[PDB]
Design a protein around this ligand. Structure first.
Ligand code: HEM
Ligand SMILES: Nc1ccnc(N)n1
Length: 292
Protein backbone atom coordinates (compact mmCIF):
# COMPACT_ATOMS: atom_id res chain seq x y z
CA UNK A 1 0.00 0.00 0.00
CA UNK A 2 3.18 2.25 0.31
CA UNK A 3 4.57 3.52 -2.98
CA UNK A 4 7.62 5.67 -3.76
CA UNK A 5 7.47 7.18 -7.19
CA UNK A 6 10.70 8.46 -8.74
CA UNK A 7 10.54 12.23 -9.17
CA UNK A 8 13.32 13.79 -11.22
CA UNK A 9 15.02 16.72 -9.47
CA UNK A 10 13.34 19.64 -11.11
CA UNK A 11 14.89 20.68 -14.41
CA UNK A 12 17.87 18.28 -14.24
CA UNK A 13 19.05 15.94 -17.02
CA UNK A 14 21.84 13.42 -17.69
CA UNK A 15 24.47 16.14 -18.05
CA UNK A 16 23.78 17.52 -14.52
CA UNK A 17 24.16 14.08 -13.02
CA UNK A 18 27.36 13.49 -14.96
CA UNK A 19 28.70 16.58 -13.23
CA UNK A 20 28.00 15.05 -9.84
CA UNK A 21 29.57 11.74 -10.85
CA UNK A 22 32.63 13.69 -12.03
CA UNK A 23 32.90 15.48 -8.71
CA UNK A 24 32.78 12.23 -6.80
CA UNK A 25 35.32 10.67 -9.14
CA UNK A 26 37.79 13.56 -8.93
CA UNK A 27 37.62 13.46 -5.20
CA UNK A 28 38.13 9.63 -5.16
CA UNK A 29 41.27 10.23 -7.27
CA UNK A 30 42.46 12.99 -4.92
CA UNK A 31 41.86 11.31 -1.48
CA UNK A 32 44.04 8.32 -2.13
CA UNK A 33 45.65 8.04 1.31
CA UNK A 34 42.51 6.91 3.15
CA UNK A 35 42.61 3.53 4.87
CA UNK A 36 46.29 2.71 4.25
CA UNK A 37 46.05 3.85 0.60
CA UNK A 38 42.91 1.85 -0.36
CA UNK A 39 41.03 5.06 -1.08
CA UNK A 40 37.37 5.78 -0.55
CA UNK A 41 36.05 3.55 -3.32
CA UNK A 42 35.19 0.53 -1.16
CA UNK A 43 33.48 2.43 1.69
CA UNK A 44 31.36 4.28 -0.95
CA UNK A 45 30.15 0.99 -2.32
CA UNK A 46 29.35 -0.34 1.16
CA UNK A 47 27.46 2.90 1.81
CA UNK A 48 25.32 2.53 -1.27
CA UNK A 49 24.56 -1.08 -0.24
CA UNK A 50 23.75 -0.24 3.40
CA UNK A 51 21.38 2.60 2.52
CA UNK A 52 19.58 0.26 0.05
CA UNK A 53 19.75 -2.90 2.12
CA UNK A 54 17.29 -1.70 4.81
CA UNK A 55 14.51 -2.46 2.35
CA UNK A 56 11.69 -4.83 3.17
CA UNK A 57 9.88 -6.03 0.02
CA UNK A 58 6.81 -6.96 2.11
CA UNK A 59 5.83 -3.36 3.10
CA UNK A 60 8.23 -1.14 1.17
CA UNK A 61 9.84 0.24 4.29
CA UNK A 62 13.50 1.24 4.23
CA UNK A 63 15.38 1.29 0.94
CA UNK A 64 17.40 4.03 -0.81
CA UNK A 65 14.53 6.22 -1.81
CA UNK A 66 14.19 8.35 1.30
CA UNK A 67 17.83 9.13 1.96
CA UNK A 68 17.20 8.33 5.60
CA UNK A 69 20.79 7.52 6.41
CA UNK A 70 21.21 11.29 6.98
CA UNK A 71 19.23 10.78 10.26
CA UNK A 72 20.93 9.74 13.47
CA UNK A 73 18.97 6.54 14.13
CA UNK A 74 20.28 5.11 10.85
CA UNK A 75 23.73 6.90 10.80
CA UNK A 76 24.36 5.41 14.27
CA UNK A 77 23.25 1.81 13.41
CA UNK A 78 26.08 -0.53 14.65
CA UNK A 79 25.81 -2.25 11.26
CA UNK A 80 26.86 1.03 9.65
CA UNK A 81 29.96 1.65 11.84
CA UNK A 82 32.65 3.11 9.57
CA UNK A 83 30.25 4.47 6.94
CA UNK A 84 30.50 8.01 8.47
CA UNK A 85 33.78 8.25 6.53
CA UNK A 86 31.84 7.81 3.25
CA UNK A 87 29.18 10.31 4.32
CA UNK A 88 31.88 12.91 5.16
CA UNK A 89 33.53 12.25 1.82
CA UNK A 90 30.21 13.02 0.05
CA UNK A 91 29.54 16.19 2.13
CA UNK A 92 31.48 18.68 -0.12
CA UNK A 93 29.86 17.09 -3.24
CA UNK A 94 26.39 17.71 -1.76
CA UNK A 95 27.45 21.31 -1.06
CA UNK A 96 28.52 21.78 -4.68
CA UNK A 97 25.30 20.22 -5.97
CA UNK A 98 22.66 21.00 -3.29
CA UNK A 99 19.81 20.20 -5.72
CA UNK A 100 20.55 16.44 -5.63
CA UNK A 101 18.60 14.25 -3.30
CA UNK A 102 20.36 12.40 -0.50
CA UNK A 103 19.28 8.95 -1.78
CA UNK A 104 20.49 9.87 -5.26
CA UNK A 105 23.83 11.10 -3.98
CA UNK A 106 24.49 8.02 -1.74
CA UNK A 107 23.53 5.56 -4.48
CA UNK A 108 25.45 7.49 -7.14
CA UNK A 109 28.54 7.39 -4.92
CA UNK A 110 28.41 3.62 -5.12
CA UNK A 111 28.08 3.54 -8.88
CA UNK A 112 30.86 6.09 -9.23
CA UNK A 113 33.17 4.09 -7.12
CA UNK A 114 32.67 0.80 -8.89
CA UNK A 115 33.21 2.43 -12.29
CA UNK A 116 36.27 4.44 -11.25
CA UNK A 117 37.78 1.22 -9.75
CA UNK A 118 37.61 -0.17 -13.32
CA UNK A 119 34.46 -2.22 -12.64
CA UNK A 120 31.48 -2.59 -14.96
CA UNK A 121 29.26 0.30 -15.97
CA UNK A 122 26.24 0.37 -13.70
CA UNK A 123 23.16 2.13 -15.12
CA UNK A 124 21.69 4.47 -12.57
CA UNK A 125 18.42 6.32 -12.24
CA UNK A 126 17.65 9.57 -10.52
CA UNK A 127 14.52 10.51 -8.72
CA UNK A 128 14.87 9.40 -5.09
CA UNK A 129 13.17 12.01 -2.82
CA UNK A 130 14.24 12.73 0.81
CA UNK A 131 11.55 11.65 3.25
CA UNK A 132 11.20 12.76 6.85
CA UNK A 133 12.95 11.53 9.97
CA UNK A 134 10.01 9.37 11.04
CA UNK A 135 10.42 7.16 7.93
CA UNK A 136 13.90 6.10 8.96
CA UNK A 137 14.01 2.29 9.45
CA UNK A 138 14.96 0.80 12.79
CA UNK A 139 18.34 -0.80 13.18
CA UNK A 140 18.73 -4.48 12.71
CA UNK A 141 17.79 -4.88 9.08
CA UNK A 142 21.34 -5.32 7.66
CA UNK A 143 22.91 -8.79 7.76
CA UNK A 144 25.04 -10.55 10.35
CA UNK A 145 28.34 -12.06 9.21
CA UNK A 146 28.58 -14.95 11.70
CA UNK A 147 26.01 -17.12 9.88
CA UNK A 148 25.70 -19.87 7.30
CA UNK A 149 24.36 -20.00 3.72
CA UNK A 150 20.78 -20.77 4.88
CA UNK A 151 20.80 -17.45 6.69
CA UNK A 152 22.28 -15.63 3.72
CA UNK A 153 19.65 -17.05 1.33
CA UNK A 154 16.70 -16.12 3.64
CA UNK A 155 18.12 -12.68 4.42
CA UNK A 156 18.50 -11.77 0.80
CA UNK A 157 14.98 -12.95 -0.17
CA UNK A 158 13.76 -9.91 1.84
CA UNK A 159 15.56 -7.82 -0.79
CA UNK A 160 14.01 -9.93 -3.61
CA UNK A 161 17.37 -11.34 -4.45
CA UNK A 162 17.92 -14.88 -5.68
CA UNK A 163 20.96 -17.15 -5.64
CA UNK A 164 22.80 -15.65 -8.65
CA UNK A 165 22.15 -12.12 -7.34
CA UNK A 166 23.45 -12.97 -3.84
CA UNK A 167 26.65 -14.56 -5.18
CA UNK A 168 27.18 -11.67 -7.71
CA UNK A 169 26.64 -9.01 -5.10
CA UNK A 170 29.04 -10.65 -2.64
CA UNK A 171 31.94 -10.29 -5.07
CA UNK A 172 32.08 -6.68 -3.98
CA UNK A 173 33.93 -8.19 -0.96
CA UNK A 174 37.08 -8.15 -3.15
CA UNK A 175 37.01 -4.47 -2.24
CA UNK A 176 38.40 -2.78 0.89
CA UNK A 177 38.75 -4.70 4.09
CA UNK A 178 37.24 -5.60 7.35
CA UNK A 179 38.29 -3.45 10.28
CA UNK A 180 38.20 -4.86 13.80
CA UNK A 181 36.90 -1.58 15.36
CA UNK A 182 33.96 -1.39 12.85
CA UNK A 183 32.64 -4.96 12.73
CA UNK A 184 34.73 -7.25 14.87
CA UNK A 185 36.47 -8.72 11.81
CA UNK A 186 39.97 -7.95 10.49
CA UNK A 187 41.79 -8.15 7.15
CA UNK A 188 41.34 -7.80 3.41
CA UNK A 189 39.80 -10.37 1.13
CA UNK A 190 42.50 -10.26 -1.52
CA UNK A 191 45.52 -8.30 -2.89
CA UNK A 192 43.78 -6.02 -5.39
CA UNK A 193 41.34 -4.38 -3.04
CA UNK A 194 40.70 -1.10 -4.82
CA UNK A 195 40.32 -2.45 -8.35
CA UNK A 196 37.05 -4.17 -9.14
CA UNK A 197 37.79 -7.78 -10.27
CA UNK A 198 36.51 -11.40 -9.71
CA UNK A 199 39.24 -11.85 -7.07
CA UNK A 200 36.79 -12.79 -4.28
CA UNK A 201 35.73 -15.95 -6.06
CA UNK A 202 39.23 -16.93 -7.09
CA UNK A 203 40.40 -16.48 -3.50
CA UNK A 204 37.52 -18.54 -2.11
CA UNK A 205 38.38 -21.48 -4.39
CA UNK A 206 42.17 -21.27 -4.51
CA UNK A 207 43.38 -20.22 -1.10
CA UNK A 208 44.20 -22.54 1.82
CA UNK A 209 41.69 -21.35 4.46
CA UNK A 210 42.02 -22.01 8.15
CA UNK A 211 39.22 -21.26 10.62
CA UNK A 212 40.46 -19.00 13.38
CA UNK A 213 39.20 -16.78 16.18
CA UNK A 214 40.25 -13.14 15.80
CA UNK A 215 41.12 -10.57 18.48
CA UNK A 216 37.36 -9.81 19.04
CA UNK A 217 36.61 -13.54 19.63
CA UNK A 218 34.74 -13.93 16.30
CA UNK A 219 35.44 -16.83 13.86
CA UNK A 220 36.83 -15.92 10.45
CA UNK A 221 38.62 -17.91 7.72
CA UNK A 222 42.22 -16.84 7.24
CA UNK A 223 44.62 -17.81 4.44
CA UNK A 224 48.34 -18.29 4.39
CA UNK A 225 48.44 -15.24 2.06
CA UNK A 226 46.99 -12.96 4.78
CA UNK A 227 43.43 -12.81 3.37
CA UNK A 228 40.20 -13.44 5.32
CA UNK A 229 36.66 -14.48 4.64
CA UNK A 230 33.66 -13.90 6.88
CA UNK A 231 31.57 -16.93 7.84
CA UNK A 232 28.94 -15.65 5.37
CA UNK A 233 31.54 -15.35 2.59
CA UNK A 234 32.84 -18.88 3.23
CA UNK A 235 29.25 -20.17 3.18
CA UNK A 236 29.19 -19.54 -0.57
CA UNK A 237 31.60 -22.47 -0.94
CA UNK A 238 29.73 -24.64 1.55
CA UNK A 239 26.30 -24.48 -0.10
CA UNK A 240 26.16 -26.52 -3.31
CA UNK A 241 24.10 -24.05 -5.27
CA UNK A 242 26.27 -21.09 -4.27
CA UNK A 243 29.53 -23.00 -4.95
CA UNK A 244 28.42 -23.57 -8.57
CA UNK A 245 27.93 -19.88 -9.11
CA UNK A 246 31.19 -19.00 -7.31
CA UNK A 247 33.02 -21.37 -9.75
CA UNK A 248 31.29 -19.68 -12.65
CA UNK A 249 32.39 -16.18 -11.59
CA UNK A 250 35.93 -17.39 -10.79
CA UNK A 251 36.13 -18.77 -14.36
CA UNK A 252 34.55 -15.75 -16.04
CA UNK A 253 35.00 -12.11 -14.92
CA UNK A 254 32.91 -10.74 -17.84
CA UNK A 255 29.90 -12.72 -16.64
CA UNK A 256 30.44 -11.70 -13.01
CA UNK A 257 30.61 -8.04 -14.15
CA UNK A 258 27.37 -8.34 -16.08
CA UNK A 259 25.50 -10.03 -13.21
CA UNK A 260 26.93 -7.66 -10.60
CA UNK A 261 25.95 -4.61 -12.64
CA UNK A 262 22.28 -5.79 -12.92
CA UNK A 263 22.09 -6.91 -9.24
CA UNK A 264 23.63 -3.73 -7.87
CA UNK A 265 21.29 -1.50 -9.94
CA UNK A 266 18.37 -3.60 -8.74
CA UNK A 267 19.55 -3.29 -5.11
CA UNK A 268 19.87 0.48 -5.43
CA UNK A 269 16.39 0.74 -6.96
CA UNK A 270 14.44 -1.66 -4.79
CA UNK A 271 11.25 -0.01 -3.48
CA UNK A 272 11.17 2.64 -6.28
CA UNK A 273 8.50 2.85 -8.89
CA UNK A 274 9.73 4.46 -12.10
CA UNK A 275 6.88 6.01 -14.00
CA UNK A 276 6.68 4.64 -17.57
CA UNK A 277 7.79 8.05 -18.93
CA UNK A 278 10.82 8.56 -16.62
CA UNK A 279 14.18 9.04 -18.30
CA UNK A 280 15.90 5.82 -19.36
CA UNK A 281 18.70 4.77 -16.99
CA UNK A 282 21.90 6.85 -17.12
CA UNK A 283 25.23 5.36 -17.94
CA UNK A 284 27.88 7.81 -16.88
CA UNK A 285 31.17 8.20 -18.62
CA UNK A 286 34.26 7.63 -16.45
CA UNK A 287 36.84 10.42 -15.97
CA UNK A 288 39.07 8.43 -18.38
CA UNK A 289 36.44 8.34 -21.07
CA UNK A 290 36.05 12.16 -20.81
CA UNK A 291 39.77 13.03 -20.65
CA UNK A 292 39.34 14.43 -17.15
C1 HEM B 1 25.71 -11.44 3.76
C2 HEM B 1 25.74 -10.17 3.41
C3 HEM B 1 26.89 -9.28 3.88
C4 HEM B 1 27.54 -9.28 5.06
C5 HEM B 1 27.35 -10.11 6.34
C6 HEM B 1 28.58 -8.27 4.98
C7 HEM B 1 29.45 -7.94 6.03
C8 HEM B 1 30.48 -7.06 5.85
C9 HEM B 1 31.38 -6.68 6.89
C10 HEM B 1 31.33 -7.24 8.31
C11 HEM B 1 32.28 -5.82 6.40
C12 HEM B 1 33.43 -5.14 7.17
C13 HEM B 1 33.05 -3.73 7.68
C14 HEM B 1 34.19 -3.05 8.37
O1 HEM B 1 34.72 -3.64 9.37
O2 HEM B 1 34.57 -1.91 7.98
C15 HEM B 1 31.97 -5.65 5.01
C16 HEM B 1 32.65 -4.78 4.20
C17 HEM B 1 32.30 -4.51 2.94
N1 HEM B 1 31.12 -4.85 2.40
FE1 HEM B 1 29.92 -6.34 2.96
N2 HEM B 1 28.58 -7.71 3.72
C18 HEM B 1 27.52 -8.27 3.02
C19 HEM B 1 27.19 -7.95 1.70
C20 HEM B 1 27.76 -6.96 0.95
C21 HEM B 1 27.24 -6.50 -0.32
C22 HEM B 1 25.97 -7.03 -0.93
C23 HEM B 1 28.03 -5.50 -0.76
C24 HEM B 1 27.92 -4.62 -2.01
C25 HEM B 1 27.51 -4.99 -3.22
C26 HEM B 1 29.07 -5.33 0.22
C27 HEM B 1 30.12 -4.45 0.09
C28 HEM B 1 31.10 -4.38 1.08
C29 HEM B 1 32.28 -3.60 0.84
C30 HEM B 1 32.67 -2.92 -0.48
C31 HEM B 1 33.09 -3.72 2.08
C32 HEM B 1 34.45 -3.09 2.36
C33 HEM B 1 34.23 -1.71 3.06
C34 HEM B 1 35.51 -0.97 3.43
O3 HEM B 1 36.61 -1.36 3.08
O4 HEM B 1 35.46 0.07 4.17
N3 HEM B 1 28.86 -6.20 1.26
N4 HEM B 1 30.83 -6.35 4.73
N1 LIG C 1 37.06 -6.78 2.15
C1 LIG C 1 36.25 -7.83 2.52
C2 LIG C 1 34.97 -7.53 3.05
C3 LIG C 1 34.12 -8.54 3.44
N2 LIG C 1 34.54 -9.83 3.27
C4 LIG C 1 35.79 -10.08 2.78
N3 LIG C 1 36.15 -11.37 2.68
N4 LIG C 1 36.66 -9.12 2.39
Amino acid sequence: TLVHVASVEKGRSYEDFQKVYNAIALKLREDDEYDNYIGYGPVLVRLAWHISGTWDKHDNTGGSYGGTYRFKKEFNDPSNAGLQNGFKFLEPIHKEFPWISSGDLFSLGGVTAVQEMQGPKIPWRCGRVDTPEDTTPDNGRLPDADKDAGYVRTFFQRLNMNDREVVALMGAHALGKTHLKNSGYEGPGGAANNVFTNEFYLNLLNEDWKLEKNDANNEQWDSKSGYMMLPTDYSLIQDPKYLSIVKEYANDQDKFFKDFSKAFEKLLENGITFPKDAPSPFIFKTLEEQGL
